[PDB]
Design a protein around this nucleic acid. Structure first.
Lengths: 49, 129, 148, 323, 50, 210, 60, 167
RNA sequence: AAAAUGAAGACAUUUUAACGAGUAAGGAAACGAAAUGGCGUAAGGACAACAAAAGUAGUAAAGAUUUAAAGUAAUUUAGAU
RNA sequence: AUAAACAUACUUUGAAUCGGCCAAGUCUGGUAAGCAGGACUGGCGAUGCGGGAUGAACCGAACGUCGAGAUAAAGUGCCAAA
RNA sequence: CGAGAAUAGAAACUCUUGAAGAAGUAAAUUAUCUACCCGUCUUGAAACACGGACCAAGGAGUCUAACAUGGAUGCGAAUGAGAAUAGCAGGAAAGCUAUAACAUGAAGAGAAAACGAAAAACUAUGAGAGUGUAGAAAUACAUUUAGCAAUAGUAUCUUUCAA
RNA sequence: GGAAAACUUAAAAGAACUUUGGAAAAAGAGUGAAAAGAGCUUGAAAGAGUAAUAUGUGAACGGAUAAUUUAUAAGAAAAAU
């Protein structure tokens, strides 16, 4: 450390590379849930309440 | 009318040690070595590109004919410099075919535009033709 | 944008702007906040003089929701209902209707008294009141109401 | 706010309608190319798929360095014997068949963030720039034959368009086909390694058909014409209105889309209803013109006369120059 | 009127643009190079300024 | 545009499926177009080629007419008895032709070509009459909105709008200042070039009058 | 591995590049540490003058 | 050579609008024209303040305008910065010229009978500046200024950038 | 650096004056009078014959070898094979 | 008295560096050292050019590309201009 | 004899060479002057210091995360709400919409209990705006008003054992 | 433990007969748009061979200035009164 800075507290000393979760499935969770909601809307028809 | 073009140095600033090693090309590079003979400007080896060699602003980028180079690709690009035929000279690009080169050369005669590639890609009509 | 980095302007310079005497080696005094009491003590004294030590009593399990108490000054009370409502009841007094400023509804629990109040009676309803907050509200002709 | 009238044209008969529509307030928003460049630079990165090299690529050997004392460099060497690989270089970034410099990880930041009000600011400055014929033509569009550059077509004409022969007819009637034909005649093939990835054709841009909620059935007719993109009025973005970070797109509006512009974007005095929390900005100048100030200052005899710098005489030697 | 930068020349059955004039209304102008004046002849007995 | 997520628009997968296609699929890709006389007789545009058919080469060096002697589905080519080359030492070899460079001028119809031709003809009629149902409905909508016009107008010439109404927008003054230098110089050069073309045209028109 | 212990060489040249910074005028006008009575006397008059200035503002 | 004290380096004063804003670029052109021709020290001041960076053009609330224009009734406030709205206190009637006006600030100024002007109208009406009050916002109120220096200092300590184990 | 001029000319304006050595190191991009100026590699989005066929290309692409020209230089341009 | 507005006062952020060596109308330990260590200044390092035949530090003088002249150190038998 | 001033006048040229190749430029050779091996560590290397036989291709400040400063940008006592998430058209890893949890901020001090900011401020210097006169070309002095930013210092107020 | 190695052409039309030779091959001939001739698209550098040109006493190369040789390369107008 040099000059004026905050004291750094970063918990990367472990293996974070195997702890990384990526949200590439986020755009397809929306499609999966919405489609399941629509099939839920039928079957129990009316009042999928 | 044509101004006198003055070149402060007509030689090439060849890279240091390019005359001794085939891996070192001749394109210029600044010697950054701590002990380098050239960057210290020793006597004998004291030739580096400086802004002081810059040519005059009036005649910079001027062709020996006294005009400027304007690259053209078809007959429409000639119309961009028809109003400045005393300043610009046409220059057909290297990839333009021989057929389109005839139209550019023919149209430039009509518009009185000088072409510097007027003898390029001429057909077999040199000997007995 | 990696074309605007300094690495593109230091191509050809041997050491990439890190010096020839003191190279760009792996470490420059340790890893993390190492040597905070031995050789980086001048850094911790200069910039974080109370880093090392203890102060105060431990709270084994802190209930930070008990210390939640948003505050609003008296000068900021009328902005909760807007200037339009403020001018509507500008000439109100004792006897007729006076707008009620429910701070809890807006997320403010305690009313502190800082700045000035427009000279109109107002009913301020909140959970806690500062001492000067009640004085300033009463001096303007208003009333203080408690909640919860 | 005079709010000049805008004429609406029948797309089939070519006849102007009898009721002009006032220009929506979104067309007077400041045209800020620096804001659009900020938003467009961020938004153009959002279609990117995640890519990365294999995590074990180049690291699949038990190689160790031979050390010193063996007249070879200290880079790790492939262990064993019997093949040309054994005793060769190893994981090092400079070695052949070793891992590269910091291997590209698939959890890189692919998509970018942009504040919503900055995106809405950029879209407004892109709709405004499409009503300036000087900017639209400078973008590379052929609009010399259109009646009005804020081109609006009757909603009754759009309601009957069901085939691409009818859609092409409407673009010919409103003189918008010259830009479509520019895309057809200039369609070329991509240069470089991008063709092995499947991207071969490279087309130019033509008119953008902005349609409303009642014109959903005319999208099919327009989608097969080369160089014609259709976008709904609510879903406009800098990727449509300023493709290639060059604003001034040629937009063909419809009646339903045009009459929704005041609701979607609000006014310079009113809050937007479609985009809640957003209002059209005022430029740093109310009338972006320097001429009216210059003449008014001259009317008050406040500006001095224009100065032409005197020619400084060359230094002479009075001891030798008698003159 | 012809712009000062425009000096039309005859096209020998070559393809010409729409704006360019035809050959039936183009008159070739001689190329002019000399633009200075020769020294004036004075009286035989008067001496030259030089 | 393709909206079927099951099929692929990747060129590499398309060529791979071409080289590894089974024999059943290779027959259909090796198809040729019927000639004018055969098309009228059967109302079929094209069929997979067959041995002992008679074709006519329509593209290539030699436009000869011959009989099919081989249909080589491994190479996706055919052979014609009248298109051969003498292999130096005297003997001749057939020359391979792609089946898209020939048209079938005579059919070898045993019993399954007869069934195939009938099936193809019936399917052509059904789609032709299906298109007619769609065309009239599209025509019906147009007439109900423009009763004074007919749908044949969409195939004739178009008369563009000539009205040139301008709009006063307080941004035309700023337009030259909203362009970067690279696009400003191009725009100003185009203005100057366009103006000079009109100047020469006006000079030409003046000479033409006199 | 003995080294040179000390030298004042180049130190005066260094100290005169950005020359000796003088203190500002406000450094000489500090009051902390002054006489207790003088501070008491000064505060009394400043309070008196300010209170007299403020009643004039109320009057007008 | 010549024994110079220092060599010629760029003067650290801005002479043009920063950024690529087309409207701010024209305002500098307008006031650069007025400052050169009218030779008024008012136009030189406005031109100089147009070239300052965003952090050197601090905002001025309506309460600052209200206090600074109490004894300038028929005057015009001229602040080369954004004008914000102090919702705690009322807005009297006054004329303000500024680069930008907050949506709530413009509504409050106009509702009180005042007028929000831009710098093109001010130059049109008062080019040399005749009934104007020049105002600039406070610069030392930035919370970044609190951490400048040494926090161990005995006289004016800094404010100790928060981080790990901050007590 | 200072004056003058300034919607587009053009060579990053005109005039005047002073100045120009350099290891380590610094000077990101944008900013009309521009808070240094540029060359090169690859890929992506645009633009590239304005009157309805709109950059070049079997009348010879890229590449390779040389010959000349432009640039202080990085490099570029063109000819021939 | 003299000089000083591209003066003056700075603010923020940050790089590299803290192995140094030389000279002398200077000093200390040592018989002494091209030794060890210091006070002031100028240098070399980081610096080429003219001269001392040669030379990191001496003398003159510090460098954009050039033309013409007066010069500096120092030289004028030849090498070598006089 | 004669400055100023007033009155009137007198300068526009030759020769040689060049498509049988001018001027300039380039290449090779000769001659005069000139030139120690590059990179690196180092007080100091051409060094009897180390690496380097030669050529092509590859080859080394990158990515993720936290904080800060700073230049451009939007909004501004609020900002973000591409928090999850839920909808829309179009089929879409793109785009648009969601009175909204929370983050940072609007209040600060104290270990904590317990609290929680006006004398609607003062003083100094200071940005700007007018008039008059004169030099006289620009400009220089007198005089009326204004007092922002910044700096320093004061009263008053909040919390603390302590400001 | 652990490699290297992609490409004739549109199509084999992959030379086919003669002379020389033990053979491999070569020279003719022929196919082809073109040898692209199977060591097969282009074909760089290092390294060689041939042809043309030039120089020469213990290094070679570079730079400034000229000389020699070679190459490039500048024009069809036009006097006095």
């Amino acid at each position: 450390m040099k000059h004026n800075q905050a004291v750094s507290n970063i918990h990367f000393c472990k293996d974070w590379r195997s702890k990384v979760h990526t949200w590439f499935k986020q755009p397809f969770r929306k499609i999966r849930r919405h489609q399941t909601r629509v099939e839920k809307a039928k079957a129990v028809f009316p009042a999928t309440i | 009318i044509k101004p006198k073009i003055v070149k402060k140095y007509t030689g090439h600033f060849k890279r240091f040690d390019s005359n001794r090693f085939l891996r070192v090309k001749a394109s210029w590079r600044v010697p950054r070595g701590i002990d380098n003979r050239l960057r210290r400007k020793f006597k004998g080896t004291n030739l580096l590109p400086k802004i002081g060699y810059g040519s005059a602003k009036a005649t910079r980028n001027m062709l020996p004919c006294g005009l400027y180079k304007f690259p053209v690709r078809n007959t429409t690009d000639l119309e961009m410099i028809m109003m400045q035929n005393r300043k610009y000279a046409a220059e057909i690009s290297h990839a333009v075919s021989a057929k389109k080169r005839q139209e550019i050369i023919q149209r430039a005669k009509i518009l009185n535009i000088r072409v510097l590639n007027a003898d390029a890609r001429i057909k077999k009509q040199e000997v007995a033709q | 944008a990696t074309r605007f980095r300094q690495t593109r302007r230091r191509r050809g310079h041997v050491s990439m702007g890190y010096g020839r005497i003191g190279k760009h080696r792996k470490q420059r005094g340790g890893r993390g906040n190492a040597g905070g009491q031995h050789h980086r003590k001048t850094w911790f004294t200069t910039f974080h003089p109370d880093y090392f030590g203890k102060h105060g009593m431990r709270v084994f399990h802190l209930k930070a929701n008990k210390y939640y108490c948003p505050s609003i000054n008296v000068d900021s009370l009328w902005s909760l209902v807007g200037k339009d409502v403020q001018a509507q009841y500008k000439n109100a007094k004792v006897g007729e209707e006076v707008p009620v400023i429910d701070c809890v509804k807006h997320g403010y629990f305690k009313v502190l008294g800082k700045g000035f109040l427009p000279k109109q009676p107002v009913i301020v309803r909140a959970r806690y009141f500062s001492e000067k907050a009640q004085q300033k509200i009463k001096a303007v002709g208003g009333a203080c109401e408690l909640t919860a | 706010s005079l709010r000049p009238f805008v004429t609406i044209y029948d797309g089939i008969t070519g006849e102007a309608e009898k009721t002009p529509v006032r220009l929506p307030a979104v067309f007077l928003a400041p045209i800020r190319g620096d804001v659009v460049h900020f938003v467009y630079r961020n938004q153009s990165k959002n279609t990117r798929q995640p890519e990365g090299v294999s995590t074990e690529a180049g690291k699949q050997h038990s190689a160790i360095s031979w050390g010193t004392g063996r007249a070879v460099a200290r880079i790790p060497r492939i262990s064993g014997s019997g093949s040309g690989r054994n005793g060769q270089g190893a994981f090092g970034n400079m070695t052949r068949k070793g891992h590269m410099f910091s291997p590209l990880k698939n959890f890189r930041k692919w998509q970018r963030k942009t504040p919503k009000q900055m995106r809405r600011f950029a879209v407004a400055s892109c709709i405004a720039a499409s009503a300036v014929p000087a900017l639209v033509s400078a973008r590379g569009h052929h609009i010399a034959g259109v009646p009005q550059i804020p081109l609006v077509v009757n909603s009754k004409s759009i309601s009957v368009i069901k085939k691409t022969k009818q859609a092409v007819y409407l673009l010919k009637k409103i003189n918008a086909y010259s830009d479509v034909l520019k895309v057809i005649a200039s369609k070329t093939v991509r240069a470089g390694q991008g063709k092995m990835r499947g991207r071969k054709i490279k087309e130019r841009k033509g008119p953008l058909v902005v349609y409303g909620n009642d014109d959903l059935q005319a999208v099919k007719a327009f989608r097969n014409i080369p160089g014609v993109d259709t976008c709904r009025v609510e879903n406009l973005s800098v990727l449509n209105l300023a493709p290639g970070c060059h604003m001034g797109r040629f937009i063909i509006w419809t009646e339903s889309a045009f009459k929704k512009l005041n609701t979607i974007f609000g006014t310079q005095k009113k809050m937007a209803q479609g985009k809640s929390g957003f209002r059209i900005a005022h430029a740093q100048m109310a009338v972006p013109d320097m001429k009216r100030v210059v003449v008014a200052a001259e009317k008050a005899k406040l500006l001095r006369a224009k100065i032409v710098l005197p020619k400084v005489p060359k230094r002479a030697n009075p001891l030798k120059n008698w003159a | 009127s012809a712009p000062q930068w425009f000096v039309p020349v005859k096209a020998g059955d070559a393809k010409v643009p729409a704006y360019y004039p035809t050959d039936d209304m183009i008159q070739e102008q001689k190329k002019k190079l000399r633009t200075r004046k020769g020294a004036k002849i004075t009286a035989l007995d008067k001496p030259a300024w030089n | 545009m393709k909206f079927n997520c099951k099929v692929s628009s990747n060129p590499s997968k398309a060529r791979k499926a071409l080289y590894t296609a089974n024999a059943s699929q290779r027959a259909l890709m090796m198809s040729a177009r019927l000639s004018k006389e055969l098309r009228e007789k059967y109302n079929v545009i094209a069929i997979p080629i067959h041995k002992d058919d008679e074709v006519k080469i329509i593209k290539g060096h030699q436009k000869v007419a011959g009989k099919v002697t081989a249909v080589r589905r491994s190479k996706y080519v055919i052979n014609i008895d009248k298109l051969t080359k003498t292999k130096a030492n005297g003997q001749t070899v057939p020359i391979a032709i792609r089946p898209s460079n020939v048209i079938i001028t005579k059919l070898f119809l045993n019993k399954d070509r007869e069934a195939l031709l009938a099936k193809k003809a019936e399917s052509r009629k059904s789609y032709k009459e299906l298109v007619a149902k769609r065309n009239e409905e599209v025509a019906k909508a147009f007439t109900a909105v423009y009763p004074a016009l007919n749908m044949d107008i969409f195939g004739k010439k178009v008369e563009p709008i000539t009205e040139k109404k301008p709009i006063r927008i307080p941004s035309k003054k700023m337009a030259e200042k909203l362009m970067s230098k690279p696009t400003l110089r191009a725009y100003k050069t185009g203005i100057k070039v366009h103006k000079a073309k009109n100047a020469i045209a006006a000079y030409k028109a003046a000479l033409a009058k006199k | 591995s003995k080294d040179k212990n000390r030298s004042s060489h180049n130190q005066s040249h260094k100290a005169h590049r950005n020359g000796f910074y003088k203190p500002k005028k406000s450094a000489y006008m500090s009051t902390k540490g002054m006489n207790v009575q003088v501070l008491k006397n000064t505060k009394a008059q400043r309070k008196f003058a300010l209170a007299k200035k403020l009643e004039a503002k109320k009057a007008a | 050579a010549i024994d110079l004290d220092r060599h010629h380096v760029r003067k650290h004063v801005s002479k043009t609008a920063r950024g690529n804003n087309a409207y701010m670029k024209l305002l500098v052109r307008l006031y650069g024209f007025l400052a050169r021709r009218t030779q008024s020290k008012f136009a030189k001041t406005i031109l100089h303040r147009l070239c300052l960076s965003r952090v050197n053009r601090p905002i001025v609330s309506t309460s600052k305008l209200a206090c600074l224009m109490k004894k300038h009734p028929e005057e015009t406030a001229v602040c080369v910065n954004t004008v914000t709205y102090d919702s705690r206190y009322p807005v009297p009637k006054m004329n303000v010229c500024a680069l930008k006006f907050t949506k709530t600030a413009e509504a409050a100024i106009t509702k009180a009978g005042g007028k929000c002007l831009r710098f093109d109208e001010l130059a049109l009406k008062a080019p040399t500046g005749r009934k104007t009050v020049l105002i600039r916002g406070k610069r030392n109120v930035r919370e970044a200024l609190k951490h400048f220096g040494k926090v161990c200092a005995k006289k004016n300590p800094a404010k100790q950038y928060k981080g790990k184990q901050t007590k």
